Amino acid sequence: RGPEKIRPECFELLRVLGKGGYGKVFQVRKVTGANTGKIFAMKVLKKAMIVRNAKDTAHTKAERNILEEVKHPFIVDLIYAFQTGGKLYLILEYLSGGELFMQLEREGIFMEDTACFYLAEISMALGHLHQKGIIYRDLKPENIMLNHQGHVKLTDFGLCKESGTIEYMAPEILMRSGHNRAVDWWSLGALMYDMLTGAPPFTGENRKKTIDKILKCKLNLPPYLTQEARDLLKKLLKRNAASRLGAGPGDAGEVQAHPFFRHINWEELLARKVEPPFKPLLQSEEDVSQFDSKFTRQTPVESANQVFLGFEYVAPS
Ligand SMILES: CCc1cncnc1N1CCN(Cc2nc3cc(C(F)(F)F)ccc3[nH]2)CC1
């Protein structure tokens, strides 16, 4: 009758949210103890293959450490972490709003009024990551998800699926010239562009032809844009890192003070009091309408042991 153990047998596998090389992401229901009947996302990783590559072991541990350390409204929360021999488990909150990119397709284009909200919430998460000395490097529409009410949540701090897309990355990543916090304000710019045009600013016929267009860095001004958004974009998508907005000593604050966010109340927005532009389909909590039909499956598939010593975690709440 002590504290709860948190084994894999504590969860019922409902469905597959994502499959990748290193493991699987399930939608699960906690069936015993504390949160009985509550829905989670469960990331399950294969120990055997993580330990083969130091860079892989890094991101797995980083994610684990990052998510324990970071508690924030616009960053996905880690509920439990535990392990078996051969497998690692991460229990994260289930985000039923799906991808933000998903809304974009349906809308075709975001209005600046709507884009602002999502960018501002993303900006808060990004600046906080920087207060914790962390650089998302590759931020892209695939990484931004929505909670049940439609608020921003940032999500893959660990391994990569399929062992991604470069058109949202800063030129300095590609030229290996070294990077910094400003790399994300670039990626934010690339996102803003995608939000208001439907496409990334620099795209090519192939892997390298895309790369060169980014390094070229040619402005493309759609006529329907306001000067605020126009000017905001030109500062974020500056090739020059030092001259980029958010690269200064004020970081996120320097970006957020922009007249494009002149209508934003941050005290309210961070409290998540502001109504999101999209309250997404509400059939039930375990509503899975937006990810599949892609994944619809339901199945779970050693010498020098440590690492993954002290991997176990349970969020205080
Ligand atoms: C866990 C956060 C989340 C919360 N709520 C609902 N949906 C979510 N996701 C967000 C992440 N996910 C994309 C994805 N990341 C993956 C990582 C792997 C890995 F094993 F790490 F290689 C494998 C497949 C993966 N699919 C879709 C389901």
Side-chain angles (χ1 to χ4, degrees), residues 17-25 41 43-45 76 92-96 145 155-156 159-161 291:
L17 304 174
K19 196 181 179 181
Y22 293 102
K24 264 160 280 180
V25 183
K43 177 138 68 174
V44 187
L45 315 179
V76 74
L92 308 96
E93 54 173 328
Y94 173 70
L95 315 167
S96 56
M145 283 194 68
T155 57
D156 260 293
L159 296 151
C160 212
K161 10 155 185 177
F291 326 47

Short mmCIF file of all heavy atoms in Angstrom, two decimals, residues 17-25 41 43-45 76 92-96 145 155-156 159-161 291, ligand 1:
data_model
loop_
_atom_site.label_atom_id
_atom_site.label_comp_id
_atom_site.label_asym_id
_atom_site.label_seq_id
_atom_site.Cartn_x
_atom_site.Cartn_y
_atom_site.Cartn_z
N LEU A 17 -0.40 6.96 -32.27
CA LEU A 17 -0.39 8.36 -32.68
C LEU A 17 0.75 8.63 -33.66
O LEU A 17 0.64 9.49 -34.53
CB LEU A 17 -0.29 9.28 -31.47
CG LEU A 17 -1.35 9.15 -30.36
CD1 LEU A 17 -1.00 10.04 -29.18
CD2 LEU A 17 -2.75 9.48 -30.87
N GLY A 18 1.84 7.88 -33.50
CA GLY A 18 3.00 8.00 -34.37
C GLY A 18 3.93 6.81 -34.26
O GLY A 18 4.16 6.29 -33.17
N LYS A 19 4.46 6.38 -35.40
CA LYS A 19 5.47 5.34 -35.44
C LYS A 19 6.76 5.88 -36.05
O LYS A 19 6.73 6.72 -36.95
CB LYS A 19 4.98 4.12 -36.22
CG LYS A 19 5.80 2.86 -35.99
CD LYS A 19 5.29 1.68 -36.79
CE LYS A 19 6.15 0.45 -36.56
NZ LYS A 19 5.69 -0.72 -37.35
N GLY A 20 7.89 5.40 -35.53
CA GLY A 20 9.20 5.83 -36.00
C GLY A 20 10.23 4.72 -35.89
O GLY A 20 9.89 3.57 -35.57
N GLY A 21 11.48 5.06 -36.17
CA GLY A 21 12.58 4.09 -36.15
C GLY A 21 12.95 3.65 -34.75
O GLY A 21 13.11 2.45 -34.49
N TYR A 22 13.09 4.61 -33.84
CA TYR A 22 13.54 4.33 -32.48
C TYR A 22 12.44 3.82 -31.55
O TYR A 22 12.74 3.19 -30.53
CB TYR A 22 14.23 5.55 -31.87
CG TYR A 22 15.53 5.91 -32.56
CD1 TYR A 22 15.59 6.96 -33.47
CD2 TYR A 22 16.70 5.19 -32.30
CE1 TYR A 22 16.77 7.28 -34.11
CE2 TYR A 22 17.89 5.51 -32.93
CZ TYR A 22 17.92 6.56 -33.84
OH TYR A 22 19.09 6.89 -34.47
N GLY A 23 11.19 4.08 -31.90
CA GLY A 23 10.07 3.61 -31.09
C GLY A 23 8.69 4.03 -31.57
O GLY A 23 8.51 4.42 -32.72
N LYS A 24 7.72 3.94 -30.67
CA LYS A 24 6.33 4.25 -30.98
C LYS A 24 5.73 5.25 -30.00
O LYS A 24 6.17 5.35 -28.85
CB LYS A 24 5.49 2.97 -30.99
CG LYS A 24 5.29 2.38 -32.37
CD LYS A 24 4.89 0.91 -32.31
CE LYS A 24 6.10 0.02 -32.07
NZ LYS A 24 5.72 -1.42 -32.00
N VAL A 25 4.73 5.99 -30.47
CA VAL A 25 3.95 6.87 -29.61
C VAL A 25 2.50 6.39 -29.61
O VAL A 25 1.81 6.45 -30.64
CB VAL A 25 4.01 8.35 -30.07
CG1 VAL A 25 3.24 9.24 -29.10
CG2 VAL A 25 5.46 8.82 -30.18
N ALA A 41 -0.35 10.40 -23.82
CA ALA A 41 0.50 9.94 -24.90
C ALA A 41 1.67 9.20 -24.27
O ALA A 41 2.28 9.69 -23.31
CB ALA A 41 0.99 11.10 -25.74
N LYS A 43 5.29 7.58 -25.19
CA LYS A 43 6.42 7.37 -26.09
C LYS A 43 7.25 6.20 -25.59
O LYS A 43 7.77 6.22 -24.46
CB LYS A 43 7.25 8.65 -26.21
CG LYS A 43 8.49 8.51 -27.07
CD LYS A 43 8.71 9.71 -27.99
CE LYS A 43 9.08 10.97 -27.22
NZ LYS A 43 9.44 12.08 -28.15
N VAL A 44 7.37 5.17 -26.42
CA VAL A 44 8.11 3.95 -26.07
C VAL A 44 9.32 3.78 -26.98
O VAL A 44 9.18 3.66 -28.20
CB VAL A 44 7.22 2.68 -26.17
CG1 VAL A 44 7.96 1.47 -25.63
CG2 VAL A 44 5.91 2.88 -25.42
N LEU A 45 10.51 3.77 -26.38
CA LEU A 45 11.76 3.73 -27.14
C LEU A 45 12.55 2.44 -26.88
O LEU A 45 12.55 1.93 -25.76
CB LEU A 45 12.63 4.95 -26.81
CG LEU A 45 11.96 6.33 -26.76
CD1 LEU A 45 12.96 7.41 -26.39
CD2 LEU A 45 11.29 6.67 -28.09
N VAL A 76 4.99 20.91 -23.74
CA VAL A 76 4.37 19.65 -23.33
C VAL A 76 4.90 19.16 -21.98
O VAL A 76 6.11 19.23 -21.72
CB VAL A 76 4.50 18.56 -24.44
CG1 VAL A 76 5.92 18.02 -24.53
CG2 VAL A 76 3.51 17.42 -24.21
N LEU A 92 3.57 11.47 -21.50
CA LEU A 92 3.34 12.90 -21.65
C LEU A 92 1.84 13.14 -21.77
O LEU A 92 1.09 12.25 -22.16
CB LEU A 92 4.06 13.44 -22.88
CG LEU A 92 5.56 13.15 -23.06
CD1 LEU A 92 5.78 11.95 -23.96
CD2 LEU A 92 6.24 14.37 -23.64
N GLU A 93 1.42 14.36 -21.43
CA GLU A 93 0.02 14.75 -21.59
C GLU A 93 -0.43 14.57 -23.04
O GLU A 93 0.33 14.83 -23.98
CB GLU A 93 -0.18 16.21 -21.15
CG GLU A 93 0.74 17.21 -21.83
CD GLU A 93 0.40 18.65 -21.49
OE1 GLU A 93 -0.78 18.96 -21.26
OE2 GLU A 93 1.34 19.48 -21.45
N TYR A 94 -1.66 14.11 -23.21
CA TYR A 94 -2.22 13.91 -24.54
C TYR A 94 -2.78 15.21 -25.10
O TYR A 94 -3.62 15.86 -24.47
CB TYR A 94 -3.30 12.81 -24.51
CG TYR A 94 -4.05 12.65 -25.81
CD1 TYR A 94 -3.43 12.11 -26.94
CD2 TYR A 94 -5.38 13.04 -25.92
CE1 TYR A 94 -4.11 11.97 -28.13
CE2 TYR A 94 -6.08 12.89 -27.11
CZ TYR A 94 -5.44 12.36 -28.21
OH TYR A 94 -6.13 12.22 -29.39
N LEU A 95 -2.31 15.60 -26.28
CA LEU A 95 -2.72 16.84 -26.92
C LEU A 95 -3.70 16.56 -28.05
O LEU A 95 -3.32 16.08 -29.12
CB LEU A 95 -1.49 17.61 -27.43
CG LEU A 95 -0.29 17.72 -26.48
CD1 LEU A 95 0.94 18.23 -27.22
CD2 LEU A 95 -0.59 18.60 -25.28
N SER A 96 -4.98 16.86 -27.80
CA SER A 96 -6.06 16.47 -28.71
C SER A 96 -6.35 17.46 -29.84
O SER A 96 -7.16 17.17 -30.73
CB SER A 96 -7.34 16.16 -27.93
OG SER A 96 -7.72 17.26 -27.12
N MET A 145 2.01 21.55 -31.56
CA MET A 145 0.72 20.91 -31.37
C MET A 145 -0.22 21.77 -30.55
O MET A 145 0.17 22.81 -30.02
CB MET A 145 0.90 19.53 -30.73
CG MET A 145 1.37 18.47 -31.71
SD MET A 145 1.19 16.79 -31.07
CE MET A 145 -0.59 16.61 -31.01
N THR A 155 6.65 20.16 -28.81
CA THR A 155 6.97 18.74 -28.64
C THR A 155 7.88 17.52 -28.78
O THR A 155 7.63 16.49 -28.15
CB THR A 155 5.83 17.83 -29.15
OG1 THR A 155 5.55 18.13 -30.52
CG2 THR A 155 4.57 18.02 -28.31
N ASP A 156 8.92 17.66 -29.59
CA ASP A 156 9.92 16.60 -29.82
C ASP A 156 11.22 17.27 -29.37
O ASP A 156 11.82 18.07 -30.09
CB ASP A 156 9.79 16.60 -31.36
CG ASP A 156 8.91 15.48 -31.87
OD1 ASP A 156 9.31 14.30 -31.74
OD2 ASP A 156 7.81 15.77 -32.39
N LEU A 159 14.39 12.04 -29.77
CA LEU A 159 14.87 11.46 -31.01
C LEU A 159 14.01 11.83 -32.21
O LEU A 159 12.89 12.34 -32.06
CB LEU A 159 14.93 9.93 -30.89
CG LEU A 159 15.91 9.38 -29.85
CD1 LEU A 159 15.40 8.06 -29.31
CD2 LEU A 159 17.31 9.25 -30.42
N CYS A 160 14.54 11.57 -33.40
CA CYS A 160 13.84 11.83 -34.64
C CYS A 160 13.21 10.54 -35.15
O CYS A 160 13.84 9.47 -35.15
CB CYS A 160 14.81 12.38 -35.69
SG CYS A 160 14.08 13.54 -36.87
N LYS A 161 11.94 10.64 -35.56
CA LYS A 161 11.27 9.60 -36.33
C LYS A 161 11.99 9.46 -37.68
O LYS A 161 12.62 10.40 -38.15
CB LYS A 161 9.80 9.97 -36.54
CG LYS A 161 9.48 11.40 -36.10
CD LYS A 161 8.28 11.99 -36.80
CE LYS A 161 8.11 13.45 -36.38
NZ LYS A 161 6.98 14.11 -37.08
N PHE A 291 -4.90 12.98 -36.87
CA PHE A 291 -3.53 12.49 -37.09
C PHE A 291 -3.51 11.41 -38.15
O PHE A 291 -2.83 11.50 -39.17
CB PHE A 291 -3.01 11.88 -35.79
CG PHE A 291 -3.52 12.57 -34.56
CD1 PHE A 291 -4.86 12.87 -34.42
CD2 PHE A 291 -2.65 12.90 -33.53
CE1 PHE A 291 -5.34 13.51 -33.29
CE2 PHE A 291 -3.11 13.54 -32.39
CZ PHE A 291 -4.46 13.84 -32.28
C1 LIG B 1 4.11 12.80 -27.34
C2 LIG B 1 3.43 14.13 -27.66
C3 LIG B 1 1.97 13.94 -28.09
C4 LIG B 1 1.01 14.17 -27.11
N1 LIG B 1 -0.27 14.02 -27.38
C5 LIG B 1 -0.68 13.67 -28.58
N2 LIG B 1 0.18 13.44 -29.56
C6 LIG B 1 1.51 13.56 -29.36
N3 LIG B 1 2.37 13.31 -30.45
C7 LIG B 1 3.53 14.21 -30.72
C8 LIG B 1 4.70 13.46 -31.36
N4 LIG B 1 4.26 12.55 -32.43
C9 LIG B 1 5.15 12.58 -33.59
C10 LIG B 1 6.15 11.46 -33.34
N5 LIG B 1 7.27 11.56 -32.61
C11 LIG B 1 7.85 10.37 -32.60
C12 LIG B 1 9.03 9.90 -32.01
C13 LIG B 1 9.39 8.57 -32.17
C14 LIG B 1 10.68 8.03 -31.55
F1 LIG B 1 10.42 6.84 -31.00
F2 LIG B 1 11.12 8.86 -30.61
F3 LIG B 1 11.60 7.88 -32.49
C15 LIG B 1 8.58 7.71 -32.91
C16 LIG B 1 7.41 8.17 -33.49
C17 LIG B 1 7.05 9.51 -33.33
N6 LIG B 1 6.01 10.21 -33.76
C18 LIG B 1 2.82 12.50 -32.73
C19 LIG B 1 2.07 12.22 -31.42
#
